[PDB]
């Protein structure tokens, strides 16, 4: 139980670190890829229109 509390606190610290300093850049990368592919699709559509 005591070690369970210790490891739970450790996991809370790990999750805080991840959300603070790891989630933001990864979310940015995912949004960047999604925007890039969306722009590629839209540019293909306008090329077909042209």
């Amino acid at each position: 139980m005591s070690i369970f509390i210790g490891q739970l606190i450790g996991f809370a610290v790990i999750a805080f670190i991840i959300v603070k300093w790891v989630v933001p850049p990864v979310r940015t990368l995912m949004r960047n890829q999604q925007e890039a592919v969306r722009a590629a699709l839209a540019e293909s559509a306008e090329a077909a229109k042209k």
Binding site: S44, A48, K50
Partner: protein, 60 residues
């Protein structure tokens, strides 16, 4: 990947093909103009021949 390559080719081909259509329009215009000029030239040459012939006959 095929979509992106085809889109780049689409932009290139559309631009060059618009230019080609305009050039073909101008080519047809030039050909028709040359045909018209040739008709007028040969018509006036035939007229000149007719006038020369009939003047020569009148003189004779």
């Amino acid at each position: 990947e095929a979509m992106l390559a085809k889109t780049a080719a689409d932009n290139r081909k559309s631009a060059e093909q618009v230019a080609a259509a305009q050039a073909d329009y101008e080519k047809e215009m030039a050909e028709a103009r040359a045909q018209a000029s040739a008709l007028r030239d040969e018509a006036r040459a035939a007229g000149r021949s007719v006038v020369d012939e009939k003047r020569a006959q009148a003189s004779g």
